[PDB]
Paper text:
Major histocompatibility complex ([name]) class I molecules ([name] I) present antigen peptides to the surface of antigen presenting cells (APCs) to active T cells through interaction with T-cell receptors (TCRs), which play pivotal roles in antiviral defense. In this study, we screened bat [name] I [name]–binding peptides from different bat-borne viruses (HeV, EBOV, MERS-CoV, and H17N10) and determined the structures of bat [name] class I complexed with these viral peptides. The overall structures of [name] display the common characteristics of classical [name] I molecules in other mammals, with the extracellular region of the heavy chain folding into three different domains. The α1 and α2 domains construct a typical PBG that contains two α1-helices and eight β-sheets, and the α3 domain and β2m display typical immunoglobulin (Ig) domains and underpin the peptide binding domain.
To verify the uncommon peptide presentation features of bat [name] I, we determined the crystal structures of [name] in complex with the two HeV-derived peptides, HeV1 (DFANTFLP) and [name] (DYINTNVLP), two EBOV-derived peptides, EBOV-NP1 (DFQESADSFL) and EBOV-NP2 (DFQESADSFLL), one H17N10-derived peptide, H17N10-NP (DFEKEGYSL), and one MERS-CoV-derived peptide, MERS-CoV-S3 (DFTCSQISP). Although having different lengths, the 8-mer peptide HeV1, 9-mers [name] and H17N10-NP, 10-mer EBOV-NP1, and 11-mer EBOV-NP2 in the PBG of [name] all display an M-shaped conformation, with P2 and PΩ residues as the primary anchors and the P5 or P6 residue as the secondary middle anchors. The structures of [name] with the 9-mer peptides [name] (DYINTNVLP) and H17N10-NP (DFEKEGYSL) showed that both of the peptides adopt similar overall conformations as the HLA-A*0201–presented 9-mer peptide GL9 (GILGFVFTL) with a Leu at the PΩ site. Although [name] can bind peptides with Leu as the PΩ anchor, the binding peptides can also possess Pro at this position. Detailed comparative analysis of the F pockets of [name] and HLA-A*0201 revealed that the F pocket of [name] is shallow but with a wide opening. The [name]–specific Gly80 in [name] is small, which provides more space to accommodate the pyrrolidine ring of PΩ-Pro. Indeed, detailed analyses showed that the P2-Tyr of [name]–binding peptides form hydrogen bonds directly with the main chain of the β-sheet on the floor of the PBG. In this position, the P2-Tyr of the peptides form hydrogen bonds directly with the main chain of the β-sheet on the floor of the PBG of [name], which leads to a stable anchoring of the P2-Tyr. Substitution of Ala at P1 ([name]-D1A), P2 ([name]-Y2A), and P9 ([name]-P9A) of peptide [name] led to nearly no refolding for [name], whereas Ala at P1 (HeV1-D1A), P2 (HeV1-F2A), and P8 (HeV1-P8A) of peptide HeV1 still supported refolding but with significantly lower stability than the original peptide.
Numbering used by the authors:
A (entry chain C): 1 to 9
B (entry chain A): 1 to 277
C (entry chain B): 1 to 98
Write the structure that this text describes.
């Protein structure tokens, strides 16, 4: 999978 | 020898072409298997390799789950563009770019060799996960804002848990499903061509076609002596069929062609090759 | 610092007149991502497909633009690239010897 969590820069 | 699962995100603003765009692609080694493009209406994660046609039945939620992840990423990095511009106080009439590359290398024992997550802003290193996967290196004062936000968010540990767990599991899964494509080493098909220019000079071009993986070494020699400095070596290029091409060419005096040899090393060859006109 | 594209134009298989083949324009090493890439037949744009945007370790982008074609002794093929790093489009002729 694409990683399921992303954090705003 | 190792294999790698790698994901590549690009978010960019295109003033005059409309709203910012996001494109996310995955690769196993040198083969692309998946894409997401925000320019689509109701964008979905989509298979780019034939072996990916089998995952729907093994993982019926794969495409919806990857669609949700990529949509969330598309939102994050396009908003991120405005966040980083604000750190620099850059005007919104300029085009700016955020890129992210993350993934895992696995060795022959099936275990993680290394994970990585790196980000770039306008083509330059911005913030990267350190090799310990608990901490971040920030390129400048603006990226330290990002670093503080990600330390507060505990994002390094979420990263580590993916790169060490799920990334490795999925790389192994893809290598199994895509065995016939991924575990090939297709050797180059090689030949020399001969291109007279003038009356007293001719070009010898040594070709390597149809090879996978991408890594290859082409050399010219004169009487056992390396010609690397005098040759024209093109960058390795995709052939559009999932393999690669390369060539190396040299100007030699007419009548002397038999003095030069081309040498090809590629992991699909049983031994390195020597070719002569 | 904008980065200028490098361009190669080439067939998938060694060219032979009358036999169907695949024409490629590979453009790489460029930054930022917005770019215009077209294959031209006798100076006129051809219908092409373009690969998904990806990039290399130095962060520079690469793209493959391609279409079916059947080479001839008559027809000339070229690739036209325009990019924010350029002040004018970059025209590269196809040479079946590369």
């Amino acid at each position: 999978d694409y990683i399921n969590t992303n954090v705003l820069p | 020898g190792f294999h790698s699962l790698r994901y590549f995100y690009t978010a960019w603003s295109r003033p005059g072409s409309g709203e910012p765009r996001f494109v996310a692609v995955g690769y196993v080694d040198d083969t692309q298997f998946v894409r997401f493009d925000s320019d689509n209406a109701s964008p979905r994660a989509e298979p780019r390799a034939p072996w990916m046609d089998l995952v729907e039945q093994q993982d019926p939620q794969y495409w919806d789950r990857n669609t949700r992840n990529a949509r969330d990423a598309a939102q994050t990095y396009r908003v991120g563009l405005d966040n980083v511009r604000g750190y620099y106080n850059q005007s919104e009439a300029g085009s700016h770019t955020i890129q992210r590359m993350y993934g895992c290398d696995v060795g022959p024992h099936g275990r993680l060799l290394r994970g990585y997550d790196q980000l770039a802003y306008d083509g330059a290193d911005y913030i990267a996960l350190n090799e310990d996967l608990r901490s971040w290196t920030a390129a400048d004062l603006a990226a330290q804002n990002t670093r503080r936000k990600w330390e507060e968010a505990g994002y390094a540990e979420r990263d580590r848990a993916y790169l060490e767990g799920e990334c490795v599991e999925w790389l192994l899964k893809h290598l199994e499903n895509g065995r016939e494509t991924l575990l090939r080493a297709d050797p180059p098909k090689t030949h020399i061509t001969h291109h007279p220019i003038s009356d007293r000079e001719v070009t010898l071009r040594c070709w390597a076609l149809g090879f996978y993986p991408e890594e290859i070494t082409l050399t010219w020699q004169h009487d056992g002596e390396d010609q690397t400095q005098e040759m024209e070596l093109v960058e390795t290029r995709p052939d559009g069929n999932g393999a690669f091409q390369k060539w190396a060419a040299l100007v030699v005096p007419s009548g002397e062609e038999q003095r030069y040899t081309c040498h090809v090393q590629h992991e699909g060859l049983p031994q390195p090759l020597t070719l002569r006109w | 610092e904008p980065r200028t594209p490098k361009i190669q134009v080439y067939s998938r298989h060694p060219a032979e007149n009358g036999k169907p083949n695949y024409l490629n324009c590979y453009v790489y090493g460029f930054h930022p991502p917005q770019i215009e890439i077209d294959l031209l037949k006798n100076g006129q744009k051809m219908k092409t497909e373009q690969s998904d945007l990806s990039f290399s370790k130095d962060w520079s982008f690469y793209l493959l633009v391609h279409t079916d074609f059947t080479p001839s002794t008559v027809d000339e093929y070229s690739c036209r690239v325009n990019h924010s790093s350029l002040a004018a489009p970059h025209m590269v002729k196809w040479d079946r010897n590369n």
